[PDB]
Amino acid sequence: QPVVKSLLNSKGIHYNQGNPYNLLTPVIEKVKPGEQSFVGQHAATGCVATATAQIMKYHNYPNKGLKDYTYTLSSNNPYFNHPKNLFAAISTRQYNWNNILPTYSGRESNVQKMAISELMADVGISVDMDYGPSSGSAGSSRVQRALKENFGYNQSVHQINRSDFSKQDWEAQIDKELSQNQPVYYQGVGKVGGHAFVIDGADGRNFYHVNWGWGGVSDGFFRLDALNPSALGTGGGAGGFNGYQSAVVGIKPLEHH
Numbered sequence: 001q002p003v004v005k006s007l008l009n010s011k012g013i014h015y016n017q018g019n020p021y022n023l024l025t026p027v028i029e030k031v032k033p034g035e036q037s038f039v040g041q042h043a044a045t046g047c048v049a050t051a052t053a054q055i056m057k058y059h060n061y062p063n064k065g066l067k068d069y070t071y072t073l074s075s076n077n078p079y080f081n082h083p084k085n086l087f088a089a090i091s092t093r094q095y096n097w098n099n100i101l102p103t104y105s106g107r108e109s110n111v112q113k114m115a116i117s118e119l120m121a122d123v124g125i126s127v128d129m130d131y132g133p134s135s136g137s138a139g140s141s142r143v144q145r146a147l148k149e150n151f152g153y154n155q156s157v158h159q160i161n162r163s164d165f166s167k168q169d170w171e172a173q174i175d176k177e178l179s180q181n182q183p184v185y186y187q188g189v190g191k192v193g194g195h196a197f198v199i200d201g202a203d204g205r206n207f208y209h210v211n212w213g214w215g216g217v218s219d220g221f222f223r224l225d226a227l228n229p230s231a232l233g234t235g236g237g238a239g240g241f242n243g244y245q246s247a248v249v250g251i252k253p254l255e256h257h
């Protein structure tokens with residue numbers, strides 16, 4: 001395993017799912033029975049969108065969106081009145097990567113905040129985000145399609161599933177991406193839910209650097225079979241994203257880079 005210093009940290013890239021990343025997600029409409037109100041607040045961007053947007057910022061790509069996307073929220077979503085259709089005019093977008101900053105502390109301009117919020121909202125819509133206080137997407141299978149079909153990334157983009165490879169061949173694919181300066185979209189499931197995040201480095205002893213999409217919290221080095229951030233888990237126990245694992249690899253704009 002080659003040593004690769006965190007690719008996203010080298011470019012200052014640290015996004016989250018709340019403000020000011022979520023200023024253009026749908027505004028919650030209803031109180032879920034038995035829950036406190038989130039009415040009038042923007043929905044979370046979704047960890048799938050935050051992970052994908054961080055990788056897109058690493059490439060500063062695309063300059064122009066390629067294809068619009070439309071979908072309808074599940075009618076069992078309790079936060080919105082139904083039917084609720086969502087639409088992103090991605091084919092008209094000119095993303096200004098000077099305004100989509102690597103991270104946000106609060107002092108940025110409204111133009112800069114709207115720039116990342118627009119990208120976050122477009123990406124979430126393109127993966128059929130089930131918006132709410134928490135926002136869920138199927139992840140990899142939608143991400144790989146969106147990156148190519150809506151955002152014009154190279155045909156090298158594809159999902160790989162952990163169950164299809166030996167441990168060595170799985171890690172060798174991740175290592176190959178990192179050797180080509182290509183952060184990897186990654187997701188998994190376990191006893192603290194399902195989460196999507198970015199693998200962007202390697203320490204030479206079979207640990208990988210992870211950007212969890214929480215603004216920096218819990219980022220660090222993890223084994224791919226012990227993706228267990230301490231920021232999650234109530235009661236003191238163990239838990240991580242070690243089942244049903246998949247990745248999106250080949251993420252680059254061009255045929256060679």
Ligand SMILES: *CC(=O)[C@H](Cc1cccc([N+](=O)[O-])c1)NC(=O)OCc1ccccc1
Nearest residue numbers: 046047134135136137138139187188194195
């Ligand atoms: C990480 C995140 O925002 C989201 C959390 C979540 C929100 C709403 C519903 C669920 N749910 O499990 O029904 C979860 N998780 C997420 O989007 O996970 C993506 C994913 C990870 C692993 C496998 C499939 C999908």
